[PDB]
Design an enzyme around this catalytic site. Sequence first.
Site, PDB file in Angstrom:
ATOM      1  N   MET A  92      -0.231 -58.169  50.019  1.00  0.00           N
ATOM      2  CA  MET A  92       0.404 -58.504  51.297  1.00  0.00           C
ATOM      3  C   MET A  92       1.435 -59.648  51.123  1.00  0.00           C
ATOM      4  O   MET A  92       1.239 -60.754  51.600  1.00  0.00           O
ATOM      5  CB  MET A  92      -0.676 -58.844  52.340  1.00  0.00           C
ATOM      6  CG  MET A  92      -0.216 -58.938  53.785  1.00  0.00           C
ATOM      7  SD  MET A  92       0.489 -57.402  54.445  1.00  0.00           S
ATOM      8  CE  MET A  92      -1.042 -56.498  54.790  1.00  0.00           C
ATOM      9  N   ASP A 144      -0.660 -67.217  33.750  1.00  0.00           N
ATOM     10  CA  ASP A 144      -0.646 -65.808  34.156  1.00  0.00           C
ATOM     11  C   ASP A 144       0.704 -65.103  33.998  1.00  0.00           C
ATOM     12  O   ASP A 144       1.040 -64.240  34.785  1.00  0.00           O
ATOM     13  CB  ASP A 144      -1.127 -65.750  35.619  1.00  0.00           C
ATOM     14  CG  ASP A 144      -2.626 -66.020  35.765  1.00  0.00           C
ATOM     15  OD1 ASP A 144      -3.439 -65.374  35.050  1.00  0.00           O
ATOM     16  OD2 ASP A 144      -3.001 -66.861  36.610  1.00  0.00           O
ATOM     17  N   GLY A 155       3.420 -52.545  47.682  1.00  0.00           N
ATOM     18  CA  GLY A 155       1.967 -52.666  47.527  1.00  0.00           C
ATOM     19  C   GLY A 155       1.477 -53.240  46.228  1.00  0.00           C
ATOM     20  O   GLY A 155       0.345 -53.767  46.153  1.00  0.00           O
ATOM     21  N   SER A 156       2.305 -53.212  45.176  1.00  0.00           N
ATOM     22  CA  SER A 156       1.798 -53.591  43.885  1.00  0.00           C
ATOM     23  C   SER A 156       1.500 -55.097  43.818  1.00  0.00           C
ATOM     24  O   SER A 156       0.796 -55.542  42.909  1.00  0.00           O
ATOM     25  CB  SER A 156       2.775 -53.126  42.778  1.00  0.00           C
ATOM     26  OG  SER A 156       3.904 -53.920  42.777  1.00  0.00           O
ATOM     27  N   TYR A 157       1.988 -55.883  44.798  1.00  0.00           N
ATOM     28  CA  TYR A 157       1.653 -57.287  44.890  1.00  0.00           C
ATOM     29  C   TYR A 157       0.732 -57.660  46.043  1.00  0.00           C
ATOM     30  O   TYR A 157       0.531 -58.823  46.364  1.00  0.00           O
ATOM     31  CB  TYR A 157       2.938 -58.153  45.002  1.00  0.00           C
ATOM     32  CG  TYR A 157       3.915 -58.062  43.844  1.00  0.00           C
ATOM     33  CD1 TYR A 157       4.830 -56.997  43.730  1.00  0.00           C
ATOM     34  CD2 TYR A 157       3.921 -58.999  42.887  1.00  0.00           C
ATOM     35  CE1 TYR A 157       5.709 -56.904  42.669  1.00  0.00           C
ATOM     36  CE2 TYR A 157       4.836 -58.962  41.850  1.00  0.00           C
ATOM     37  CZ  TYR A 157       5.762 -57.948  41.754  1.00  0.00           C
ATOM     38  OH  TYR A 157       6.626 -57.937  40.700  1.00  0.00           O
TER      39      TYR A 157
HETATM   40  N1  LIG Z   1      10.335 -64.600  45.688  1.00  0.00           N
HETATM   41  C1  LIG Z   1      10.213 -63.392  45.216  1.00  0.00           C
HETATM   42  N2  LIG Z   1      11.210 -62.521  45.077  1.00  0.00           N
HETATM   43  C2  LIG Z   1      10.641 -61.390  44.536  1.00  0.00           C
HETATM   44  N3  LIG Z   1      11.379 -60.289  44.253  1.00  0.00           N
HETATM   45  C3  LIG Z   1      11.042 -59.061  43.791  1.00  0.00           C
HETATM   46  C4  LIG Z   1       9.726 -58.744  43.386  1.00  0.00           C
HETATM   47  C5  LIG Z   1       9.428 -57.422  43.005  1.00  0.00           C
HETATM   48  C6  LIG Z   1      10.343 -56.425  42.983  1.00  0.00           C
HETATM   49  S1  LIG Z   1       9.936 -54.810  42.503  1.00  0.00           S
HETATM   50  N4  LIG Z   1      10.163 -54.683  40.916  1.00  0.00           N
HETATM   51  O1  LIG Z   1      10.858 -54.014  43.176  1.00  0.00           O
HETATM   52  O2  LIG Z   1       8.523 -54.694  42.663  1.00  0.00           O
HETATM   53  C7  LIG Z   1      11.670 -56.717  43.373  1.00  0.00           C
HETATM   54  C8  LIG Z   1      12.012 -58.029  43.798  1.00  0.00           C
HETATM   55  N5  LIG Z   1       9.317 -61.501  44.340  1.00  0.00           N
HETATM   56  N6  LIG Z   1       9.016 -62.790  44.782  1.00  0.00           N
HETATM   57  C9  LIG Z   1       7.714 -63.284  44.707  1.00  0.00           C
HETATM   58  S2  LIG Z   1       7.422 -64.894  44.978  1.00  0.00           S
HETATM   59  N7  LIG Z   1       6.919 -62.367  44.172  1.00  0.00           N
HETATM   60  C10 LIG Z   1       5.580 -62.576  43.848  1.00  0.00           C
HETATM   61  C11 LIG Z   1       5.132 -62.333  42.600  1.00  0.00           C
HETATM   62  F1  LIG Z   1       5.977 -61.933  41.594  1.00  0.00           F
HETATM   63  C12 LIG Z   1       3.796 -62.505  42.217  1.00  0.00           C
HETATM   64  C13 LIG Z   1       2.889 -62.866  43.187  1.00  0.00           C
HETATM   65  C14 LIG Z   1       3.296 -63.117  44.461  1.00  0.00           C
HETATM   66  C15 LIG Z   1       4.677 -62.917  44.789  1.00  0.00           C
HETATM   67  F2  LIG Z   1       5.056 -63.144  46.043  1.00  0.00           F
END
Ligand SMILES: Nc1nc(Nc2ccc(S(N)(=O)=O)cc2)nn1C(=S)Nc1c(F)cccc1F
Length: 295
Positions: free
Chosen positions: A22, A131, A18-20
Amino acid sequence: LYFQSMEKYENLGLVGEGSYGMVMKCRNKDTGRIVAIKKFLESDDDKMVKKIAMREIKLLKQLRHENLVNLLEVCKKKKRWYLVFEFVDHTILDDLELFPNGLDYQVVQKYLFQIINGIGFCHSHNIIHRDIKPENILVSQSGVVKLCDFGFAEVATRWYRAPELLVGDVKYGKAVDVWAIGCLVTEMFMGEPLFPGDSDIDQLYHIMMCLGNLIPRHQELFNKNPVFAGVRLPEIKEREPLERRYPKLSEVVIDLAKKCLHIDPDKRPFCAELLHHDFFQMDGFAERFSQELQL
Ligand SMILES: Nc1nc(Nc2ccc(S(N)(=O)=O)cc2)nn1C(=S)Nc1c(F)cccc1F
């Protein structure tokens, strides 16, 4: 712009629980590989925003680097477009959850080197991230940094925003990304954010307490803005310098952060110049690590 089908994907979770928002973590039913999927366009009936979206997709296809997240495909379901990126296994915040008082010196060197390489490549193409924050600094299983969520594709965190962004200066540029990089240096070493403000004004207060008064241009932008009527930025006669706040950090680390966090955007180094700093050059870290990344 071939559109691929969403039918081959199965939902495993939301990226970041949820922190990102949908952003769906999905498995490709044919290959088993894992992707992140985010809605990009609501409707392709709107020919105006359609053209803008296709412009951005073209940029994403061309902007390929080892330290950027990989765009795999664009999918269309009904009228909506979705971007599918390679899923990267963790973020630097995961490292900091294991090590809440800071990361290993060489780990910091390796992560900052790669962040700088990635941003430097963008800058070489006149692309500003705008950002940067820990939540968008992804890290693969093998320790390769992958940057994402560029400012071209609220309660949004202000912690890594340069003074020029906070006062609404239209003349901001590449230097905003160097400022954010500077914020990351102490955070990765110390395990806490440098300037954790909860609004534009609070953020400025946190910055100024440490770094002193703003350049005249920025103070003028603040003072001329009706949004800040009744509020003033602080006069700083006694600041709390970085070395007083973090007396155990080495002089070399402090110096790198101080250079990145110059209150005057014009006096910050270029991103690529950061790799010349003693933090990276000492003991031949930089040459050794570069050769490692190739091999
Ligand atoms: N391609 C991709 N891989 C990941 N991996 C990921 C992100 C967060 C976590 S966590 N620390 O578990 O929240 C673990 C793996 N995130 N990610 C994308 S593009 N993340 C992302 C983002 F970091 C910011 C805005 C939109 C997004 F979709």
